[PDB]
Structures are given as C-alpha cells and as structure tokens.
Amino acid sequence: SNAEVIKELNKCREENSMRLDLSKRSIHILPSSIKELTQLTELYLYSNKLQSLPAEVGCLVNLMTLALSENSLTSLPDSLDNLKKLRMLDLRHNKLREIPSVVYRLDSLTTLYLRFNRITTVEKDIKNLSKLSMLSIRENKIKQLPAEIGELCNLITLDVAHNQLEHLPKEIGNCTQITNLDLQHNELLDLPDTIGNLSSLSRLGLRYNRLSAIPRSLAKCSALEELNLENNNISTLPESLLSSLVKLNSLTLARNCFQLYPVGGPSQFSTIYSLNMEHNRINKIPFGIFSRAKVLSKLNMKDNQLTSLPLDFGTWTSMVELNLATNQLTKIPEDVSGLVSLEVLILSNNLLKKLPHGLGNLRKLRELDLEENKLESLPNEIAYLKDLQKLVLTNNQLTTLPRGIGHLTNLTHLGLGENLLTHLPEEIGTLENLEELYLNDNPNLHSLPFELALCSKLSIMSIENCPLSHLPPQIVAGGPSFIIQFLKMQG
C-alpha cells in the first residue's frame, strides 16, 4: 500500500542506501519525495501499476539501473537526460506506442529491454545508443528498421522477433559483434546479402516468415549451431551452404515448398544430430543421402510425397527416431531390420497393408505408431519387440492379433480402436505392464478374453461401440471396472 511507499523513501535516505526496491507494491503514483535520494545507483520499480513517472526521477543523476518492467507506462519524463550514467533500462511488458524521445538521448545505455509493447517505430536517432550490447524490441508492431541500425557496432543480441518486418536493412552487416540475431515470427520476404559479415553469428532465428530463399553469403556464418527455417516459402538451399555450417546441430526445413532434397550430396549432413522436413512435397529420399550422416539420430519426413523408400534405407543404422507419417508408403521393405538403434517408429497415415518379418529385429524399438493404415494383418514377428512400450494400431483392418503379442512384456499402451477384431488372444494375460487398452469401435468384438484380468496395471480402457454380447448386458453397460471384476470371477 501507500503507507510503506512514502515511509520507505525516508528509510532509504536515512540508511543512505544506493539501491531502492519498490517492486510488487501495487504503486500507482511514485511520490515526488524521491528527488531527495540522489545517492541511488539502482531503482527497481517493476511489477507495479505506474502510468507515468514523476519528473523528479531526473534528479537521480547517479542512476545506473532503472527497472520498470510490468507497468502501464506510455512515456518517460524528458528530465531523464540528467541520468548521464544510466546503463540498463528495463521497460518490457508496458504500454508504449513508440520509444520515448528521452530514451534516444541516453547514449550511455548498454542494455535496453522494450519487449512486449505496442511500439511501431524505431527512429533514426537509435544511432545515438551506440554503446548498446543488447537491443530487445521483441513482441511489438514494428514494420521497418532504419539503416542507422548499423551504427550499433557493439550489439551482441538483436531481438526483433514477433514484429512485422518485411525487410532487414542491409546495414545490419556492420554490427559485426552480433552472435544472436532473432528475426522469427515476422514477415520477411528476403534477407540482405550482408548477413555474411556477421562472422560471429552463432544463433539465427528465421522461422515463421515469408522467405523465398537464403542468401549464399550465410555460408560465412560458420558458427551457426542450428538452422531452423520453419514455416516459410523456401524450396532450395544455395550451393555449399549446409556443408559450410561446420557446427550445425540441427536443420529444420519444415513447412516450406521443398519438393526435392537440397543439393549438395551426402557431405551436407555430416554434422546434424536432427533433421526435420515435415509438411513439404518431397517425393523421394535420395539414395545414399545419409552415407555421411553418422551422427544423424532423428529424421522427420511427416506430411510429404514419399511413395517408396531408398534401397539403402536399411543402412541408416544411427537412426533412433524415424517419422514417416502422412505419406503414400504402400510397403515397408524387409531391409528395415538393419535399423537396430531405432527407438521410435511413426508410420501413421500411410497405405501399409502388412509389415515385413524383419520388423522383429528392432530390438531397441520403444514406440510403434501405425494409425490409419490399411493393415490386414500383423506380422507374427512383433512378439520379438522386447523393448516396445507403445503400440498404436488405431483405424486399420485387423481381425486377429498374433498370439505372440503376449511376449511384449514391457508394453504399456495398446491402441486397437477402429478395427475389425473378432477376438483378442488368450496370451493377452502376460502383458504385465499394460496400462491402456483402447478397443473402441470394434463391431465384431462380441467377447473379451478371460485371461485379461491378469493385467494388473490395466487402468484405462475404452469399449464404446463394442457389442460384447457374450458378456452380460448389465456388466458391459457399467464400464471398464465392471468387466474388470467380472473376468476375475471366471478364472
């Protein structure tokens, strides 16, 4: 309340402390008596309800830190020029429609947070704040940056994410000290070629824009650890780009216009641990494209045009997680038995009629999703997937499960919904760790195996739209626990 506000001001000048903390006190109007506290070097006023600052704050000439985050300020007093020693200015989470004119005059600033405001203009006077090392105008309404952005030659981070930039001024290549350039969630149509001057650039946020190409000069930013171009209008990558980024950990070309794999050969994937290409129009994975990708452990080809797999797809031995969902795959080759390090295999929404017998060789497989295929039968070799925990077979043509399904001693999730299924095997009782069994939408399931009660941890189960006519109508009308106790009786 206000009782502590005015009294702790006298408490500050009596103690003659060089730091005042009036945060989270729901303060609405800072009293003018703060002019007496000229010994202050830090003033923390964050998480309050201020809508303006008193002119008397301009008396604190020795201020070096002014924290004004989470308020409702719309401007700042023009008397703040007298703060000729101010270093960091935290104004994020406020209500500013433009940078206050006094901030363009605080040439001693090294840190300026303008995140989460309604700012629309970055004036050319921004060049006066050339001692800045951190400029964050994230989450605003800025549609253009002036060319004077190139005179902030001490910038390490330029955060302009979540704005409305259509172009980056080419003068950005003069902020050589930049290691972090975040341009994500804008409307960029292209990138300046001078981006290759930022040789210390290690992190570059480009996702969610409107880019149609990547400048070839980006190959000079050989410190990049991640190239994430998600949600754009890109179809190719320039020559020798991926091979030049010798420190790339992951590549993400998802949601673009890639109809083919980027040119460069196998020598362009020799450094990534991950590769996401989901939501594109790639019609084929090149033969031998991963003959040099020895650390690539994650591949995502979801939502594409793949109708078949390359012949050497079985040599992808370092692959741990593989996602081939939403394609037109009509067959999984027997060469899949070579992916012995695979732990997650997603094949949902394809045209799979059956699965190869080499599938049982995936000793490390932990999660197998085959939802929305044309599966007429399961291969008997699923019994040898000792490490499988999640099996999703929802929406298929399965009428029977192989009796060896009980060898899945670590299976915890089994989704058999929207299938035909005349019955479950009696070997279902050896599934010790089974916890979820979805059987809904099985019009031919008129019975449930009595050995199902041996599954102790079976808590979740759905049986809606299942006849279960061999079981009493009163038992099936209840729910899961009703049939849970019923199977324990007869056994």
Partner: protein, 168 residues
C-alpha cells in the same frame, strides 16, 4: 503457508528453464528461448510439508544478464546449473558461487550443484569432478535431466531441505 525463494543460476543453454518448467508444468520444453527473467509460484508438498515454491529463472547469456545481482540478492536458495556436455558451463560454476556469496554477503548460502542433460548419450564433464567440486563447497550435487524428468524433483527438493537447515 511456508514459502521458499529459489533462484536458478547457470550459463546460457544449460537447461535452467527446462528444469523449472518440467517441475512446474510436468513437460519438457524442446525449443530454446533465451531468458531475461521469469518468475513462478508453485505449490507443492515436500517431505510432508505443503509449501509454496517461488522460483526465479534468471539469464545465462551475459547481455541478457543485466540485473542479475538484484535477482540473486532476494533469493534464499540457489540451483547452480551446468550442462554435462558443456565444459565451459561447469568451469563457470565457481564464478556463480562467488557472485552469490558477495551479493548475499554471507559465507553459507543454501546452494545445490546441478548437472543437467544426463539423458544425452555422450558427455564432456566428469561426474567425479562435480562430486569433488560440490564436496569442497559443502553443498550437495545432483544429476538431472529435464527431458526425462530424472532427478528434477530431487534437485529442487534438496535445495528446499538446505534452506530448512539454514532456518533451523
């Protein structure tokens, strides 16, 4: 009810935000968004006590790390975090402890050394070094993984126990 003011310090990219959100929201954040500051209040029951955890998630990158002294000044316990695949972050551990000891102006400050990203197959920091380093400080050391949630509750709860020893 009782509250515990916790501060998470460590180099940028070690997993300070993933550890906090894993404990607070029970899910692993995959993206990397550098932190300026983030504060959370989460009720929990530790060793039978219903208490309120006040977690302060600070910056690791230096340009983001303006006002780091003030955040450390209000905290009661500190999670000093490093990534086991980043030897630079483990070397910086001694810098964060000395910065804490000077802003709190105290020799004994409730503190826990945390080694994150243990789910990763290959590491570059020797677990023998971290046990030895934490032993010389008088504080515990805990291997964690924000992806698999391994040791996440252990880390924050051990820090709370260290604050109890201070008050009691």
């Amino acid at each position: 009810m009782t509250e515990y003011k916790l501060v998470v310090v460590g180099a940028g990219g070690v997993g300070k935000s993933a550890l906090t959100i894993q404990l607070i929201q029970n899910h692993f954040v995959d993206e990397y968004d550098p932190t300026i500051e983030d504060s959370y209040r989460k009720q929990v029951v530790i060793d039978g006590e219903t208490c309120l955890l006040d977690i302060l998630d600070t910056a690791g990158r230096e340009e983001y790390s303006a006002m780091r002294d003030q955040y450390m000044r209000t905290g009661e316990g500190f999670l000093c975090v490093f990534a086991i695949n980043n030897s630079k972050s483990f070397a910086d551990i001694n810098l964060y402890r000395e910065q804490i000891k000077r802003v709190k102006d105290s020799d004994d400050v409730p503190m826990v050394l945390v080694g994150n990203k243990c789910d990763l197959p290959t590491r570059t920091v020797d677990t023998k070094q971290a046990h030895e380093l934490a032993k010389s400080y008088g504080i515990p050391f805990i291997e964690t993984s924000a992806k698999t949630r391994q040791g996440v509750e252990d880390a924050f709860y051990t820090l709370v126990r260290e604050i109890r020893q201070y008050r009691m």
